[PDB]
Design an enzyme around this catalytic site. Structure first.
Site, PDB file in Angstrom:
ATOM      1  CD  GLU A   1      -4.108  -5.793   2.091  1.00 21.24           C
ATOM      2  OE1 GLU A   1      -4.970  -5.010   2.557  1.00 21.24           O
ATOM      3  OE2 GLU A   1      -2.924  -5.790   2.484  1.00 21.24           O
TER       4      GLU A   1
ATOM      5  CD  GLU B   1      -3.267  -1.045   1.878  1.00 23.57           C
ATOM      6  OE1 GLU B   1      -4.246  -1.788   1.652  1.00 23.57           O
ATOM      7  OE2 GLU B   1      -3.222  -0.241   2.842  1.00 23.57           O
TER       8      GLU B   1
END
Length: 377
Positions: free
Chosen positions: A309, A168
């Site tokens: 995810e 991320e």
């Protein structure tokens, strides 16, 4: 070409496993779950205070998963780091093992079960997701050297498919400053110090030198550059690691047969996005949003795209819209043949998403799993 005899590559939008000696090639699908903890100050996958680690792996397999994404932090992959919070009565074969040894034990056992493993450099230190791949005390060279060390060790395990370079990439300020203030990731801004598309090439090249048989998984950013982000009405509302809008004009410069784009995407349990309101067209508006943020990377450009995810409470103590959201996403993945994914998470101890397991670390959420199961058949 490979120290295990196995070589992973992408052909078109599909991942293949090649036995280099026999020449046999098999297309593989990744029906995956995230099992996190090595990236936290526990320095070990969570839940071993409640369960035996092998039983956990067996349960994951019993549900039809064949892949695990394994977040780690720098110290977890160095010798000498001790795990915290394990019930050794339930885990006697872990007694006296450090974090690195437990990681090796888990990956080997996964391999015995035919389970592929994706390594995810998730935190530089065990406390929080940094927005960049370096900090004041920890340089890009440090980050790269850590990946090199990890690739040399784990490259020897046949079932390790590759490296999710940095979890991320994101921003900690708003545009316009997010593009220029040096505190957050960008893409196509031009500055190689902040442009994730350029850093991914640097990190990826170093990894492939020592693990040529691996795949390189590259996540999106949060913001890219103002031209790209302004080109779409929801351009400023992509998830951390979820904005792949700049791939088209600013592709990562890495070999096509080694590269997998890996967006993250979430529902109303993680953030109340404006587009989750029925007033803004929820949920029929979702396919076009997913398509723009990342879906086109496969559907238009033909890259391999693996959702790294996604997840949510599915109406269990969260926003009831999450049920609608996860159903719609799975419908869309099926329709558009996004067959590779890692669900967040196996763990129940994720504040805003829960997991596949309930809080007792033993029983699964049957409805949440039933929806997910559609992806595995």
């Amino acid at each position: 070409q490979t120290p295990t005899g196995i070589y992973y590559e992408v052909r078109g939008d599909t991942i293949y496993m090649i036995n280099v000696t026999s020449g046999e090639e098999t297309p593989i699908h990744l029906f995956g779950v995230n099992w996190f903890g090595f990236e936290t100050c526990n320095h070990v996958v969570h839940g071993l205070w409640k369960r035996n680690w092998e039983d956990m792996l067996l349960q994951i397999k019993s549900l039809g998963f064949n892949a695990i994404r394994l977040p780690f932090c720098t110290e977890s992959v160095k010798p000498g780091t001790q795990p915290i919070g394990i019930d050794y009565s339930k885990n006697p074969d872990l007694r006296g093992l450090d974090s690195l040894q437990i990681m090796e034990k888990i990956i080997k056992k996964a391999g015995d079960l035919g389970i592929f493993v994706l390594l995810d450099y998730h935190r530089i230190g065990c406390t929080h997701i940094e927005p960049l791949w370096y900090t004041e005390d920890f340089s890009e060279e440090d980050f790269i050297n850590t990946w090199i060390e990890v690739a040399k060790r784990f490259g020897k395990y046949w079932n390790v498919i590759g490296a999710d370079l940095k979890n991320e990439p994101h921003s900690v300020t708003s545009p316009p400053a997010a593009y220029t203030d040096g505190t957050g990731a960008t893409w196509g801004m031009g500055n190689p110090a902040t442009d994730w598309n350029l850093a991914a090439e640097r990190i990826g090249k170093a990894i492939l030198k020592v693990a040529p048989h691996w795949l390189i998984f590259v996540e999106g950013t949060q913001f890219t550059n103002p031209k790209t982000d302004s080109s779409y009405k929801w351009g400023y509302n992509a998830w951390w690691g979820g904005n792949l809008m700049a791939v088209k004009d600013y592709p990562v410069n890495l070999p096509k047969n080694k590269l997998v784009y890996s967006p993250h995407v979430y529902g109303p349990d993680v953030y109340n996005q404006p587009y989750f309101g029925p007033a803004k067209g929820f949920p029929d508006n979702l396919p076009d949003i997913w398509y723009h943020h990342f879906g086109y990377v496969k559907l238009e450009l033909g890259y391999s795209v693996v959702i790294g995810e996604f997840g949510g409470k599915y109406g269990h103590g969260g926003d009831p819209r999450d049920v609608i959201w996860q159903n719609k996403l799975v419908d869309w993945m099926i329709e558009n043949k996004f067959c590779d994914f890692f669900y967040w998470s196996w763990n129940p101890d994720s504040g805003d998403t829960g997991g596949i397991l309930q809080d007792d670390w033993t029983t699964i959420w049957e409805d949440k799993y039933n929806n997910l199961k559609r992806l595995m058949d």
